[PDB]
Amino acid sequence: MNPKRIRALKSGKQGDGPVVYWMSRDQRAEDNWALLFSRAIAKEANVPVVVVFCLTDEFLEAGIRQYEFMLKGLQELEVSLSRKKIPSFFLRGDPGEKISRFVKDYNAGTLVTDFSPLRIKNQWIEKVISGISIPFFEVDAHNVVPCWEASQKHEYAAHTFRPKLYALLPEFLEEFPELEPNSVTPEVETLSDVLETGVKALLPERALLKNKDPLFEPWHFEPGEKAAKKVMESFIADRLDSYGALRNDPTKNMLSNLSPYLHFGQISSQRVVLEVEKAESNPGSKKAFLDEILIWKEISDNFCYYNPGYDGFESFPSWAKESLNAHRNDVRSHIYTLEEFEAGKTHDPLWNASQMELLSTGKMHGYTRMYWAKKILEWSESPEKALEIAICLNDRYELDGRDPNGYAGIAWSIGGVHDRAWGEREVTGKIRYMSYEGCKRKFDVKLYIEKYS
Numbered sequence: 001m002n003p004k005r006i007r008a009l010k011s012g013k014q015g016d017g018p019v020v021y022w023m024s025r026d027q028r029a030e031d032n033w034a035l036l037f038s039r040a041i042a043k044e045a046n047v048p049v050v051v052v053f054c055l056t057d058e059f060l061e062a063g064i065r066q067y068e069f070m071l072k073g074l075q076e077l078e079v080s081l082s083r084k085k086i087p088s089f090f091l092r093g094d095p096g097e098k099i100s101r102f103v104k105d106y107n108a109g110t111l112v113t114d115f116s117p118l119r120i121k122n123q124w125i126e127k128v129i130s131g132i133s134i135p136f137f138e139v140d141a142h143n144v145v146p147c148w149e150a151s152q153k154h155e156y157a158a159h160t161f162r163p164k165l166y167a168l169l170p171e172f173l174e175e176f177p178e179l180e181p182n183s184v185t186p187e188v189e190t191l192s193d194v195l196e197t198g199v200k201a202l203l204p205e206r207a208l209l210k211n212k213d214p215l216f217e218p219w220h221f222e223p224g225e226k227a228a229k230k231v232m233e234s235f236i237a238d239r240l241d242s243y244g245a246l247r248n249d250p251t252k253n254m255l256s257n258l259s260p261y262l263h264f265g266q267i268s269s270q271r272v273v274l275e276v277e278k279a280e281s282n283p284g285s286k287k288a289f290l291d292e293i294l295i296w297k298e299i300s301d302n303f304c305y306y307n308p309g310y311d312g313f314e315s316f317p318s319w320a321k322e323s324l325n326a327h328r329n330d331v332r333s334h335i336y337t338l339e340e341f342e343a344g345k346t347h348d349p350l351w352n353a354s355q356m357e358l359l360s361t362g363k364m365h366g367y368t369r370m371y372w373a374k375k376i377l378e379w380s381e382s383p384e385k386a387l388e389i390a391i392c393l394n395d396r397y398e399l400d401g402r403d404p405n406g407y408a409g410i411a412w413s414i415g416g417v418h419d420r421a422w423g424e425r426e427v428t429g430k431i432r433y434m435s436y437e438g439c440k441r442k443f444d445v446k447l448y449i450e451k452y453s
């Protein structure tokens, strides 16, 4: 139990009621430091621990693909916490109003939440802090090394963040203790009813094709903590050996496919790292996978934590802002509207095929995501519009959307964040360029296009 994983958000007088875990980013019962630290405080206070999840009003800004994935996993989580005598309460509305009301009604003694550097999470914290008088703690349950401990500033490159993260691995990469159940039963609606009403509200905005048929295919990834562990086990046994060799081939399914589970926190990345470290596979493919799930994943939290404007043009490096400004008035080859990007109606068949994998599966290949966003910058009127369009289609149709990985991934493609300067071209400036012929020399672009008609 490392005290560097927990941070105090507000001091106060501890009540004599249950310890409340405001779960948000990490929706899992196992390998949850936030839940484990809440249980330890409750045990030392001779009081039970309870879980409170908030069903926010911002769900209509996404889709059914994300609403169903999250709520189906929360239904499985409700049973898991019930087996540990840990009751869960699912509130509907503003977190600033619901959490403050729950704390006062249930005589909460201490409040704990998990860590997320997103702007919307800091908005909820500001509202909750003003409405409570009990101690308020937060715990980094998503990163192996706490985001405030890995680096005290923003790291501009992966080769500067890698030696800092690996130096702290022997301290923070440890096994998880077992979640002790409550000593006894500690004495607001059914999730199935909340899913039915929310789906009916999202139905008019459902992504459809010409035949009025749904575009999304929900049989590619089954939600839940149990289905997440099966994906990890199958990846280590079948795909890890060839990961470093075929991670850049969109025609092969050699990725772990763990991001939808990782985003909603249905599986701990620290658990995935532990099982991969003890696995005996290709040393080149192991170094490649640990680079993505540790460095690039946690450098995205570093970027969002230390950059308030992580979604804006001001967070770009000075060399990128000066390069893009010098080419702002360059006549773009094409200018597509948001509705043309959304429906995949560009002159690039490779770009259209990437958008149809996004629309149909909700998880577009990691390599084509780089090409998909860089073409948005090439076919937009300004880098600012390219950011809005990329963020919109990302958060709406990706299952792992609305994640620090997405904003840091978009900043890398459009603004060269965590990148270097390259050959100066028109429109795109010194931002790294990915051409269509360059992709034809890396993989079979025809098979990727034909798969997503």
Ligand SMILES: Cc1cc2nc3c(=O)[nH]c(=O)nc-3n(C[C@H](O)[C@H](O)[C@H](O)COP(=O)(O)OP(=O)(O)OC[C@H]3O[C@@H](n4cnc5c(N)ncnc54)[C@H](O)[C@@H]3O)c2cc1C
Residues within 6 Å of the ligand: 247, 255, 256, 257, 258, 259, 260, 262, 263, 292, 293, 294, 296, 297, 298, 300, 364, 365, 366, 369, 370, 373, 394, 395, 398, 400, 401, 402, 403, 405, 406, 407, 409, 410, 413
């Ligand atoms: C423009 C763009 C947008 C993206 N949007 C998202 C997004 O909204 N949500 C999201 O989770 N990822 C996003 N990615 C990052 C990355 O593509 C995905 O994490 C990865 O594709 C997830 O699929 P996977 O788990 O099968 O990949 P794997 O190769 O199996 O990697 C495993 C995990 O490592 C992490 N990871 C891998 N690559 C990256 C990366 N480049 N940056 C950060 N973490 C990484 C992921 O958590 C990933 O789940 C985006 C990338 C780009 C270029």
